[PDB]
Amino acid sequence: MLSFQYPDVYRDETAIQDYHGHKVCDPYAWLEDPDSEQTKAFVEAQNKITVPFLEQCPIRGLYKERMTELYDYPKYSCHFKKGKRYFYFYNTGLQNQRVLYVQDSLEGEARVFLDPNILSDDGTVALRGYAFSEDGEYFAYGLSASGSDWVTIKFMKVDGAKELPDVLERVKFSCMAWTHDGKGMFYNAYPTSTNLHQKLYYHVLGTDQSEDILCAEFPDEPKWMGGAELSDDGRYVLLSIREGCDPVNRLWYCDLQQESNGITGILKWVKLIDNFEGEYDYVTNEGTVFTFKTNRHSPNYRLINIDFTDPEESKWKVLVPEHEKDVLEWVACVRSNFLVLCYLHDVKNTLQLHDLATGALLKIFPLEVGSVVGYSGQKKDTEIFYQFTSFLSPGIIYHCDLTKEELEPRVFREVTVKGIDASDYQTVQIFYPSKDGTKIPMFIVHKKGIKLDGSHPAFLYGYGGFNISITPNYSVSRLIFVRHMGGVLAVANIRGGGEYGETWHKGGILANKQNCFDDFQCAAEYLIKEGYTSPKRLTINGGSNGGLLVATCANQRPDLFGCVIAQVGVMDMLKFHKYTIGHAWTTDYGCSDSKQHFEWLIKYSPLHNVKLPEADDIQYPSMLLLTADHDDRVVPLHSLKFIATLQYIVGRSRKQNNPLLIHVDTKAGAGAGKPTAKVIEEVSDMFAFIARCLNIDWIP
C-alpha cells in the first residue's frame, strides 16, 4: 500500500491565460522558480514521501549491489592521434568520470593527461568539449559544473601537461576551433531565462578574454547560433548557423588568406548558403572543391561537392548519391583521399570506405548487428579506430591500418558481458503496424526459450523526436532487469526519430506529433498481443522528449501500462518555449503563440491532459518522475507542475492506489556528464520502483 499522504500544494487559481480564446489555468505556475522558498519546500515535501517508498524494499539494495558489480568493467574511447601523440579516454570501471590518457606510441606507456575526477569530491565537474591545436601541441577543454550548460574553457600545453593562464567564461553551446597558425581559437559566448545573442569570438593564446576579437554576430536574429570550424587545409573558416533543432544550417565561409592583417574584427564572410533549407555538414575539401554531407533534396542524406569558385546549385556534383532507404549518418575523410561512411540500415550500422575522388566503394568493414558509437581518423591520419556496441556487447574497438595494399581491420580492444551469460539471451527485430498502417521497427531482448504467455515484466523504451535514431547500445541496468527481474526489454523506433531519414522525423513532429504517441502505444499493444507481457506488468520509460512521450502515453492509454518512469520530461507544452533553450524545440513541437500550433499542443500536452479515467475499473499506472532541482536544459518546473497536477487530480481520487511520485535530486546536478555514482543511484531507484509496484521477486 501507500502509507503516506500527498502534500498539500498551493493552487494559484488566478493564474489564467487566454490562448486564442481558450482559457488555461496554471495553478502551479509558481514552481517555475527553482530557488524560491516555496519551490524548495515543495521539493522537500515530495522527496519526504518518495525516498522511503523507494528504499523500503530490500530489492533496491540487491539491484544496487548487482549494478555496482556488473557496471564495474573497463570503459575506453577509441585511440586518436593528435600531432605526435596518441590519446584515449579510460575509466577503470566505477570512476565518476572517465580520464584522458596520453601515449607516445601505440606500444608505449600511457600517462594520465586530464583527470576530471580531481576537480570535485563527487565527480560533478565534467569535461564538456575539447579541441587540440592543429599541431597537437596545445589543448583547450571545457568544464561544466553540476550538469550546467555553461562552460569554462581552460588550456594546457601538451608537453608536460602544463596548465596555462588562459580562461574563457560565458561559453555555452560553443564551437572550439584552432586556426592552423596556432595563434588562437574560435569559440562562442553570450553577452530559467532564455539566452539569445550568442556571438563568435576568437581568443589569442596568451591574452586575456577581454581582448578577444568579435568575428560574427547576428543582432537582428537573436536565436541564431554560428559555429566555426577550419577547413582541413586551414585556409577557410566555415561558419554553420543554426536556429532551432532541425537538421538545417546556413553556411558562410571566410578565406583567411583574404584577411589582410589576420583576424582583427568581423570577418569577410561569403554567404555561400544563406537560408535554412538544408543541412551542409563539412567533410573535407581539395582546394576550392568542398565535400558536404547534405539532406538538400535528399531525406536519407548524400554527399555533394560544391566548388566555391562556381557555387550555383546547378553546378554542384553528387559524389555519393542518396540511398533509397538507408540513412547516411556521418562521413569522415581519412588518409587524404578516403571517406568513411556510416549508414543506418533498418536501425543497425554499416561502415564503408569510399574513394574521395569518385565516391566508389572500396571496402566494407564487417560488424555484427549494433551501433558504431565512436570513431577516429582525420584527413592527415593513416589509420582508423571505431567502436561497436550492442544490447549484449559492451564494446569492441577495431583498428585498421590504411597504408596497407589489402586492408585487414582487427580487434584492438574488447570487453565482454561481465557476470551474466550473453548466450542465454537474444535480440530480435520485428516491424509492427501502427494505427495508420505504417510498419515501425522494434528491438526486443529476452531470455532464450521463454514462453509467450504474457507473464513477463517488460520495459519498453522510446524517444521519438529531433531526428535521433535509437540504435542498439549496451545497458547493464537493463540486462539486470532481464536476468534478475525476469524481464523483457523493448525499444520502439517510433516516428519523430531519424531511423528512416527526414521523412521519419517529419512523420512525428508538429501536426504529426500524435503519430509518435500512436506508434508507441501500438508497440505496447504488440508486446501484449504477442504474449511478451501484459498491461499490469509493462513499464514504459523515456527521457526529455522521451519523458513527454511516456507522460502523454500515461494520460492517453492509462489502461495499457503498469508503470511509467519519465526522466526530465517536457510536460508543459504551452510554456516550454519560454524557458532556457526551450525556444529551439519549436521546430519539433510548434509554439502555442500560434492558434494552429496551440490546437495541436493542447490535445497532448501532459500538464493539460491529466484526467481521471472514466471507467470505474481503470486508474493511472504507477508513475515516477525523476529530475534534479536545477536543470538548464529541461527546466524542472515541467516535472514539478506535472506531479502537482497528477497528485491533485488523480492521486486524491479514491480509486487511485498506484503511487504518483517524483524524486528530485538536490545534490550537485544530474544530466549530461552525470557521474557514475549518480547513474547507479538513478537506475536503482527506477528498478526498485518497478519491483515494488509490480511485486517482482528478485531472481538471484
XYZ file of C-alpha atoms in Angstrom:
700
model
C 0.000 0.000 0.000
C 0.699 3.694 0.178
C 1.210 4.575 3.860
C 1.762 8.244 3.096
C -0.299 11.313 2.145
C 0.405 13.579 -0.799
C 1.498 17.063 0.362
C -0.951 19.975 0.269
C 0.272 22.227 -2.578
C -0.992 25.802 -3.081
C -3.093 26.382 -6.193
C -2.889 29.897 -7.630
C -6.393 29.958 -9.099
C -5.762 33.483 -10.503
C -3.108 32.134 -12.901
C -5.257 32.163 -16.048
C -4.090 32.825 -19.559
C -6.177 33.197 -22.691
C -4.812 31.153 -25.585
C -6.630 32.195 -28.760
C -9.928 32.273 -26.818
C -9.173 29.074 -24.862
C -8.677 29.937 -21.159
C -5.979 27.835 -19.499
C -5.358 27.804 -15.730
C -1.799 27.159 -14.474
C -2.263 26.986 -10.689
C 1.269 25.616 -10.071
C 2.953 28.271 -12.242
C 4.979 29.384 -9.244
C 7.055 26.195 -9.368
C 8.927 27.871 -12.272
C 11.422 29.370 -9.779
C 13.832 26.662 -8.513
C 15.331 28.946 -5.856
C 12.172 30.230 -4.136
C 11.400 29.023 -0.613
C 8.025 27.775 -1.927
C 9.596 25.575 -4.635
C 12.279 24.343 -2.238
C 9.559 23.359 0.288
C 7.580 21.577 -2.438
C 10.724 19.641 -3.432
C 11.392 18.682 0.206
C 7.802 17.524 0.783
C 7.828 15.356 -2.344
C 11.160 13.706 -1.548
C 9.923 13.033 2.017
C 7.360 10.617 0.533
C 9.293 9.276 -2.447
C 12.566 8.348 -0.772
C 11.105 6.000 1.915
C 8.910 4.411 -0.723
C 11.897 3.585 -2.969
C 14.161 2.491 -0.115
C 11.684 0.315 1.812
C 12.100 -2.795 -0.249
C 15.413 -4.787 0.103
C 15.104 -5.016 -3.680
C 16.733 -1.610 -4.172
C 19.842 -2.754 -2.335
C 20.053 -6.048 -4.228
C 19.742 -4.160 -7.513
C 22.293 -1.533 -6.480
C 24.803 -4.247 -5.439
C 24.446 -6.056 -8.764
C 24.651 -2.805 -10.755
C 27.812 -1.804 -8.895
C 29.411 -5.183 -9.614
C 28.280 -5.558 -13.226
C 28.880 -1.925 -14.289
C 32.450 -2.265 -12.982
C 34.072 -3.046 -16.320
C 36.770 -1.106 -18.238
C 35.372 1.606 -20.475
C 37.559 3.031 -23.285
C 37.186 5.512 -26.113
C 38.886 4.854 -29.429
C 42.514 5.908 -29.572
C 43.023 9.098 -31.527
C 46.229 10.686 -32.709
C 46.954 14.415 -32.288
C 50.339 15.616 -33.519
C 52.961 13.104 -32.481
C 50.967 11.523 -29.642
C 48.027 9.162 -29.111
C 45.187 9.895 -26.675
C 42.269 7.886 -25.351
C 39.653 8.063 -22.594
C 39.507 5.313 -19.999
C 37.527 4.512 -16.895
C 38.753 1.563 -14.784
C 35.063 0.830 -14.188
C 33.496 2.863 -11.456
C 35.324 6.195 -11.658
C 32.842 9.053 -11.649
C 34.328 10.483 -14.811
C 36.478 8.913 -17.495
C 40.109 10.082 -17.680
C 42.071 11.297 -20.729
C 45.390 9.466 -21.200
C 48.330 10.212 -23.475
C 50.961 7.928 -25.000
C 53.937 8.496 -27.313
C 53.121 5.454 -29.452
C 50.572 2.606 -29.526
C 53.150 0.347 -27.894
C 54.072 2.900 -25.235
C 53.470 3.559 -21.557
C 50.342 5.644 -21.097
C 50.137 8.513 -18.599
C 47.234 10.498 -17.212
C 46.780 13.700 -19.240
C 43.494 15.163 -17.847
C 41.644 13.671 -14.891
C 38.317 15.455 -14.209
C 37.827 13.423 -11.019
C 40.348 15.559 -9.204
C 38.196 18.659 -9.890
C 35.460 17.743 -7.388
C 34.675 15.475 -4.402
C 31.661 13.886 -6.043
C 32.542 13.814 -9.725
C 30.197 16.699 -10.600
C 32.709 18.618 -12.723
C 32.793 17.143 -16.188
C 34.617 17.677 -19.413
C 32.288 19.363 -21.956
C 34.068 19.710 -25.289
C 37.755 19.934 -26.219
C 39.986 20.892 -29.144
C 43.613 20.293 -29.815
C 45.623 22.763 -31.828
C 46.372 21.566 -35.392
C 49.945 20.521 -34.481
C 48.718 18.664 -31.364
C 50.880 20.723 -29.024
C 48.154 22.737 -27.263
C 44.824 21.636 -25.839
C 41.660 23.518 -24.943
C 38.913 21.948 -22.880
C 35.553 22.954 -21.497
C 34.411 22.201 -17.956
C 30.820 22.154 -16.739
C 29.761 22.110 -13.154
C 26.690 20.234 -11.903
C 25.457 19.402 -15.439
C 25.027 23.148 -16.295
C 25.224 24.039 -19.987
C 27.574 26.954 -19.065
C 31.195 26.070 -19.693
C 34.592 27.401 -18.646
C 37.314 26.788 -21.271
C 40.853 26.163 -19.990
C 44.077 25.460 -21.830
C 47.139 23.258 -21.468
C 50.437 22.837 -23.243
C 50.506 19.116 -24.153
C 54.262 18.574 -23.500
C 54.409 18.178 -19.686
C 50.634 18.730 -19.389
C 51.232 22.305 -18.331
C 48.327 24.450 -17.219
C 48.158 27.827 -18.976
C 46.642 31.062 -17.606
C 44.016 31.408 -20.363
C 40.437 31.070 -19.147
C 37.257 31.702 -21.132
C 33.930 32.371 -19.354
C 30.310 32.774 -20.554
C 30.787 29.892 -23.010
C 27.706 27.862 -23.877
C 26.666 25.722 -26.928
C 30.103 26.562 -28.277
C 32.383 25.507 -31.073
C 36.126 25.140 -30.336
C 38.342 25.524 -33.392
C 42.014 26.471 -33.583
C 43.420 28.368 -36.535
C 46.242 26.335 -38.142
C 48.803 29.060 -37.398
C 48.378 28.037 -33.731
C 47.724 31.648 -32.723
C 44.286 31.199 -31.183
C 40.925 29.536 -31.153
C 37.350 30.328 -32.170
C 34.604 29.767 -29.568
C 31.138 31.094 -28.720
C 29.969 33.171 -25.792
C 26.993 35.106 -24.536
C 26.859 38.835 -23.604
C 15.238 29.908 -16.457
C 15.960 32.932 -18.743
C 16.490 32.317 -22.437
C 19.951 33.168 -23.689
C 19.913 34.884 -27.017
C 22.603 36.830 -28.941
C 25.294 34.154 -28.967
C 28.424 35.568 -30.630
C 31.546 34.098 -32.284
C 34.838 35.180 -30.772
C 38.496 34.460 -31.411
C 40.824 34.036 -28.447
C 44.540 34.719 -28.983
C 46.520 32.326 -26.754
C 48.445 34.227 -24.055
C 45.963 37.130 -23.759
C 43.020 37.949 -21.500
C 39.494 37.123 -22.698
C 38.690 40.830 -22.577
C 40.965 41.174 -25.650
C 39.142 38.571 -27.752
C 38.084 39.506 -31.278
C 34.388 39.570 -32.209
C 34.207 37.729 -35.553
C 30.464 37.190 -36.135
C 27.226 38.327 -34.561
C 23.572 38.333 -35.604
C 21.951 41.191 -33.641
C 18.767 41.159 -35.804
C 18.397 37.384 -35.316
C 18.744 36.778 -31.554
C 18.156 32.975 -31.806
C 20.873 32.328 -34.389
C 23.978 30.382 -33.276
C 27.077 30.432 -35.512
C 29.648 27.631 -35.012
C 33.075 27.834 -36.641
C 35.381 25.113 -37.926
C 38.555 25.299 -40.013
C 38.854 23.557 -43.349
C 41.319 20.644 -43.336
C 43.976 22.772 -45.083
C 43.470 25.675 -42.585
C 42.584 28.147 -45.320
C 38.868 28.702 -44.653
C 36.736 29.257 -41.566
C 33.332 27.655 -42.169
C 30.522 29.125 -40.162
C 27.449 26.875 -39.691
C 24.481 28.937 -38.484
C 21.597 27.170 -36.772
C 18.257 28.282 -35.384
C 16.167 25.634 -33.794
C 16.719 21.927 -33.764
C 16.024 20.930 -37.382
C 18.864 19.406 -39.386
C 19.419 22.563 -41.416
C 22.038 25.311 -41.395
C 23.263 28.355 -43.244
C 26.888 28.008 -44.331
C 29.107 31.025 -44.704
C 32.878 30.970 -45.191
C 35.888 33.237 -44.714
C 39.014 32.770 -46.791
C 41.627 33.613 -44.151
C 44.245 34.332 -46.905
C 41.986 37.298 -47.798
C 42.103 38.818 -44.266
C 44.802 41.468 -44.763
C 46.036 41.758 -41.183
C 44.790 38.425 -39.910
C 41.791 38.157 -37.557
C 41.155 41.696 -36.289
C 37.381 42.141 -36.344
C 34.257 40.966 -38.167
C 35.470 38.549 -40.885
C 34.782 38.998 -44.663
C 32.019 36.315 -44.680
C 30.883 34.906 -48.024
C 27.286 33.774 -47.644
C 27.531 30.608 -49.711
C 24.298 29.049 -48.373
C 22.192 31.829 -46.884
C 18.959 30.058 -45.917
C 17.800 27.235 -43.620
C 16.520 24.913 -46.381
C 19.141 22.170 -45.933
C 21.950 20.732 -43.789
C 25.549 21.208 -45.032
C 27.997 19.280 -42.881
C 31.636 19.798 -43.934
C 33.546 16.613 -44.709
C 36.735 17.792 -46.477
C 37.981 19.986 -49.300
C 40.542 19.862 -52.062
C 41.355 23.446 -52.967
C 38.046 25.191 -53.628
C 36.048 21.963 -54.029
C 34.194 21.269 -50.779
C 32.540 17.972 -49.947
C 29.473 18.206 -47.698
C 27.020 15.730 -46.305
C 23.591 17.150 -47.027
C 19.878 16.428 -46.843
C 19.061 19.001 -49.539
C 16.554 17.165 -51.804
C 17.737 14.001 -50.032
C 15.987 12.980 -46.820
C 18.229 9.927 -46.380
C 21.311 12.174 -46.924
C 24.009 12.181 -49.599
C 27.428 13.635 -50.386
C 27.819 16.638 -52.666
C 30.751 18.701 -53.894
C 30.355 22.462 -54.070
C 33.147 24.399 -55.795
C 33.382 27.806 -54.090
C 34.583 29.254 -57.415
C 31.445 28.029 -59.239
C 28.899 27.771 -56.468
C 25.476 27.828 -58.205
C 23.417 24.768 -57.233
C 23.159 23.638 -60.878
C 26.965 23.158 -60.758
C 27.132 21.025 -57.601
C 28.362 17.469 -58.140
C 26.742 14.494 -56.437
C 29.643 12.444 -55.154
C 27.701 9.728 -53.306
C 24.012 9.693 -54.244
C 21.237 9.222 -51.702
C 20.236 5.620 -50.896
C 16.518 4.774 -51.296
C 16.206 3.514 -47.713
C 19.482 3.580 -45.794
C 20.392 6.793 -43.924
C 23.892 8.178 -44.370
C 24.549 9.018 -40.699
C 28.008 10.530 -40.878
C 31.127 10.739 -43.018
C 34.821 11.310 -42.237
C 37.791 11.864 -44.528
C 40.973 9.961 -43.702
C 44.389 9.258 -45.227
C 43.963 12.200 -47.661
C 41.663 10.578 -50.177
C 39.477 8.067 -48.397
C 35.981 8.614 -46.976
C 34.490 6.567 -44.142
C 30.687 6.375 -44.494
C 28.466 5.127 -41.722
C 24.965 4.089 -42.802
C 21.925 3.116 -40.804
C 20.206 0.087 -42.343
C 16.966 -0.846 -40.514
C 18.359 0.686 -37.315
C 21.760 -1.109 -37.449
C 25.052 0.475 -38.567
C 27.248 -0.485 -41.513
C 30.620 1.118 -42.113
C 32.286 1.535 -45.540
C 35.417 3.026 -47.054
C 34.983 5.071 -50.263
C 37.303 6.863 -52.689
C 37.141 10.665 -52.295
C 37.624 11.431 -55.993
C 34.794 9.205 -57.357
C 32.686 8.149 -54.397
C 33.313 4.489 -55.320
C 33.005 1.790 -52.671
C 36.416 0.374 -51.690
C 35.861 -1.736 -48.559
C 33.072 -2.864 -46.242
C 34.162 -3.089 -42.583
C 32.266 -6.066 -41.167
C 30.227 -5.528 -37.991
C 27.785 -7.601 -36.008
C 24.266 -6.190 -35.501
C 24.516 -2.981 -33.438
C 25.870 0.540 -33.423
C 29.057 2.381 -34.200
C 29.450 4.691 -31.179
C 32.949 6.071 -31.692
C 35.432 6.678 -34.463
C 38.787 8.315 -35.097
C 40.684 9.067 -38.299
C 41.131 12.564 -39.694
C 42.452 13.625 -43.118
C 46.151 13.598 -42.183
C 45.842 10.276 -40.261
C 46.746 6.928 -41.913
C 44.622 4.624 -39.731
C 41.140 4.380 -38.269
C 39.675 3.194 -34.996
C 35.959 2.550 -34.490
C 33.920 1.306 -31.538
C 30.979 -1.033 -31.834
C 28.345 -1.803 -29.173
C 25.027 -3.643 -28.995
C 22.440 -4.801 -26.459
C 24.639 -7.767 -25.424
C 28.090 -6.333 -26.406
C 29.748 -3.813 -24.049
C 32.133 -2.667 -26.717
C 34.583 -3.758 -29.352
C 37.161 -1.278 -30.673
C 38.570 -2.129 -34.111
C 41.675 -0.699 -35.731
C 42.613 -0.589 -39.408
C 45.962 0.476 -40.865
C 45.021 2.309 -44.075
C 48.550 2.311 -45.532
C 48.275 -1.367 -46.448
C 47.511 -2.570 -50.002
C 44.941 -5.073 -48.617
C 43.003 -3.748 -45.636
C 42.732 -6.030 -42.612
C 40.638 -4.485 -39.793
C 41.387 -6.123 -36.437
C 40.092 -6.252 -32.922
C 42.029 -3.701 -30.885
C 40.087 -3.862 -27.510
C 37.155 -5.978 -26.415
C 35.071 -6.048 -23.230
C 32.562 -8.884 -22.682
C 29.414 -9.063 -20.549
C 30.743 -9.383 -17.011
C 28.831 -11.745 -14.702
C 25.890 -12.513 -16.998
C 25.984 -15.077 -19.862
C 25.208 -13.296 -23.170
C 24.499 -16.570 -24.944
C 21.390 -17.116 -22.747
C 19.717 -14.034 -24.378
C 18.692 -12.952 -27.792
C 17.805 -9.796 -29.651
C 15.146 -9.846 -32.303
C 13.933 -7.102 -34.604
C 10.279 -7.006 -35.600
C 8.150 -4.495 -37.506
C 4.676 -3.791 -36.152
C 1.818 -1.878 -37.748
C 0.898 1.493 -36.219
C -2.665 2.923 -36.202
C -2.219 4.294 -39.745
C -0.624 1.061 -41.044
C 2.963 2.303 -41.035
C 5.385 -0.539 -40.094
C 7.514 0.530 -37.096
C 10.752 -1.243 -36.064
C 11.132 -2.578 -32.551
C 14.034 -4.446 -30.965
C 13.166 -6.993 -28.279
C 15.746 -8.538 -25.941
C 14.837 -11.507 -23.759
C 15.988 -14.821 -22.319
C 16.114 -17.595 -24.958
C 13.212 -20.088 -24.790
C 10.694 -18.006 -22.822
C 7.035 -18.805 -23.115
C 4.977 -16.048 -24.721
C 2.197 -16.364 -22.161
C 2.040 -12.702 -21.105
C 3.605 -13.417 -17.711
C 6.853 -11.461 -18.024
C 7.555 -7.958 -16.803
C 8.580 -5.750 -19.732
C 10.478 -2.476 -20.056
C 9.597 -0.574 -23.214
C 11.773 2.425 -24.130
C 11.169 5.173 -26.684
C 12.211 8.737 -27.588
C 10.595 9.835 -30.836
C 11.902 13.194 -31.938
C 14.611 15.510 -33.155
C 15.895 13.179 -35.882
C 17.530 10.986 -33.202
C 17.826 7.286 -34.056
C 17.550 4.956 -31.122
C 20.093 2.323 -32.038
C 21.393 -0.758 -30.122
C 23.511 0.061 -27.103
C 24.822 -1.819 -24.090
C 22.954 -1.155 -20.837
C 23.930 -3.220 -17.787
C 20.996 -1.731 -15.920
C 18.518 -3.145 -18.428
C 20.274 -6.531 -18.549
C 19.915 -6.772 -14.741
C 16.146 -6.273 -15.264
C 16.222 -9.174 -17.723
C 18.396 -11.536 -15.705
C 17.438 -10.755 -12.089
C 13.891 -9.493 -12.565
C 12.902 -11.885 -15.392
C 12.127 -9.021 -17.709
C 11.767 -8.410 -21.427
C 13.425 -5.321 -22.904
C 11.995 -3.494 -25.887
C 12.978 -0.346 -27.854
C 10.446 1.020 -30.342
C 11.794 3.113 -33.227
C 8.791 5.384 -33.447
C 8.364 8.302 -35.837
C 9.956 11.629 -34.972
C 13.274 9.783 -34.905
C 15.865 9.720 -37.700
C 15.752 5.950 -38.332
C 14.306 6.373 -41.807
C 15.694 9.797 -42.505
C 13.991 13.148 -42.628
C 10.622 11.711 -43.676
C 10.598 9.586 -40.475
C 11.355 12.704 -38.470
C 8.639 14.773 -40.204
C 6.177 11.915 -39.655
C 6.445 12.504 -35.890
C 6.607 16.256 -35.372
C 4.407 19.367 -35.482
C 0.866 18.437 -36.636
C 2.027 14.808 -36.754
C 3.328 14.614 -33.171
C 0.405 12.353 -32.226
C 1.857 9.734 -34.660
C 4.782 9.286 -32.124
C 2.348 8.541 -29.309
C 0.250 6.256 -31.535
C 3.372 4.378 -32.628
C 4.487 3.916 -29.004
C 1.045 2.777 -27.797
C 0.965 0.320 -30.715
C 4.364 -1.027 -29.628
C 2.871 -1.759 -26.195
C -0.197 -3.409 -27.843
C 2.175 -5.625 -29.887
C 4.153 -6.821 -26.839
C 0.887 -7.640 -25.134
C -0.881 -9.315 -28.140
C 2.197 -11.380 -28.883
C 2.460 -12.593 -25.278
C 5.656 -10.896 -24.139
C 3.860 -9.136 -21.317
C 0.516 -7.866 -20.014
C -0.560 -4.277 -19.278
C -0.142 -4.567 -15.463
C 3.424 -5.877 -15.957
C 4.501 -3.353 -18.598
C 6.734 -0.405 -17.717
C 7.468 2.393 -20.157
C 10.415 4.757 -19.937
C 11.764 7.804 -21.728
C 13.866 10.899 -21.026
C 13.493 14.591 -22.098
C 11.424 14.473 -25.280
C 11.041 10.729 -24.281
C 9.663 11.887 -20.904
C 6.984 13.783 -22.866
C 6.375 10.535 -24.813
C 5.665 8.421 -21.729
C 3.730 11.113 -19.813
C 1.409 11.542 -22.805
C 1.013 7.777 -23.106
C 0.005 7.600 -19.405
C -2.741 10.155 -19.968
C -3.965 8.715 -23.262
C -3.873 4.991 -22.508
C -3.577 4.556 -18.720
C -5.076 1.090 -19.246
C -2.043 -0.110 -21.267
C 0.708 0.360 -18.661
C 1.509 -0.775 -15.138
C 4.374 1.642 -14.542
C 5.720 4.803 -16.142
C 9.161 6.325 -15.481
C 9.755 9.761 -17.039
C 13.184 11.344 -16.724
C 13.448 15.170 -17.116
C 10.292 15.197 -19.215
C 8.958 18.144 -21.228
C 5.464 18.314 -19.674
C 4.193 21.871 -20.175
C 3.782 22.080 -23.946
C 2.209 25.553 -23.736
C 5.105 27.237 -21.941
C 8.196 25.190 -22.822
C 9.471 27.806 -25.330
C 9.664 30.452 -22.560
C 12.478 28.813 -20.617
C 16.226 28.491 -21.262
C 16.904 26.723 -24.640
C 13.246 25.589 -24.992
C 12.672 28.060 -27.827
C 14.883 25.837 -30.026
C 12.460 22.888 -29.719
C 9.649 24.652 -31.595
C 10.984 23.024 -34.754
C 9.628 19.701 -33.486
C 6.723 20.910 -31.400
C 5.409 24.184 -32.757
C 4.679 27.069 -30.377
C 1.474 27.958 -28.549
C 1.796 31.608 -29.765
C 0.195 30.299 -32.982
C -3.506 29.213 -32.941
C -2.871 26.319 -35.317
C 0.052 25.057 -33.198
C -1.842 25.645 -29.961
C -4.583 23.408 -31.313
C -2.057 20.575 -31.783
C -0.264 21.188 -28.457
C -3.332 21.358 -26.240
C -4.514 17.891 -27.314
C -1.449 16.153 -25.943
C 0.407 18.468 -23.561
C 0.846 16.195 -20.497
C 0.251 19.008 -17.991
C -3.089 19.841 -19.685
C -4.473 16.325 -20.165
C -4.434 14.846 -16.720
C -7.881 13.304 -16.350
C -9.383 10.641 -14.116
C -10.160 7.648 -16.314
C -13.932 7.462 -16.906
C -14.151 3.686 -16.435
C -14.547 2.654 -12.782
C -12.044 -0.223 -13.205
C -9.195 1.876 -14.745
C -6.747 4.024 -12.772
C -3.426 5.708 -13.704
C -0.332 3.499 -13.846
C 2.248 3.844 -11.103
C 4.373 6.858 -12.088
C 7.866 8.025 -11.111
C 9.263 11.297 -12.406
C 12.978 11.985 -11.990
C 14.672 15.373 -12.295
C 17.245 17.444 -10.500
C 16.121 20.680 -8.798
C 18.188 22.684 -11.269
C 18.438 21.720 -14.929
C 19.136 24.327 -17.529
C 18.239 22.059 -20.440
C 14.779 20.891 -19.341
C 13.753 23.232 -16.539
C 12.410 21.218 -13.561
C 9.103 23.128 -13.468
C 7.941 20.652 -16.136
C 8.074 17.658 -13.797
C 7.209 19.764 -10.674
C 3.974 21.141 -12.117
C 3.096 17.793 -13.663
C 3.426 15.852 -10.412
C 1.419 18.504 -8.523
C -1.324 18.118 -11.133
C -1.231 14.303 -11.128
C -1.496 14.222 -7.297
C -4.333 16.746 -7.194
C -6.493 15.396 -10.000
C -5.771 11.656 -9.846
C -3.915 10.993 -6.598
C -6.808 12.428 -4.495
C -9.285 10.006 -6.136
C -10.475 7.030 -4.119
C -9.885 4.584 -6.977
C -6.235 5.645 -7.430
C -3.985 3.250 -5.461
C -0.937 3.268 -7.699
C 1.644 5.837 -6.480
C 2.366 9.072 -8.393
C 5.805 10.164 -7.196
C 8.736 12.417 -8.037
C 12.335 12.078 -6.882
C 14.081 15.439 -7.135
C 17.890 15.230 -6.974
C 19.080 18.184 -4.879
C 22.703 17.031 -4.859
C 25.220 18.520 -7.287
C 23.468 18.051 -10.646
C 22.329 15.160 -12.768
C 22.046 15.491 -16.599
C 24.808 15.310 -19.239
C 28.194 14.493 -17.625
C 26.368 12.586 -14.837
C 28.971 10.844 -12.650
C 28.928 7.037 -12.373
C 27.738 7.247 -8.749
C 24.567 9.122 -9.783
C 23.870 6.711 -12.675
C 23.932 3.831 -10.230
C 21.587 5.648 -7.771
C 19.171 6.552 -10.552
C 18.818 3.085 -12.099
C 18.493 1.623 -8.600
C 15.556 3.990 -7.933
C 13.957 3.110 -11.281
C 14.139 -0.633 -10.914
C 13.203 -0.621 -7.232
C 10.071 1.376 -8.178
C 9.219 -1.192 -10.816
C 9.876 -4.120 -8.436
C 7.740 -2.723 -5.651
C 4.881 -1.593 -7.877
C 4.677 -4.912 -9.759
C 5.710 -7.024 -6.706
C 8.510 -8.722 -8.689
C 10.590 -11.373 -6.883
C 14.367 -10.919 -7.246
C 15.961 -13.792 -9.177
C 19.436 -14.230 -7.676
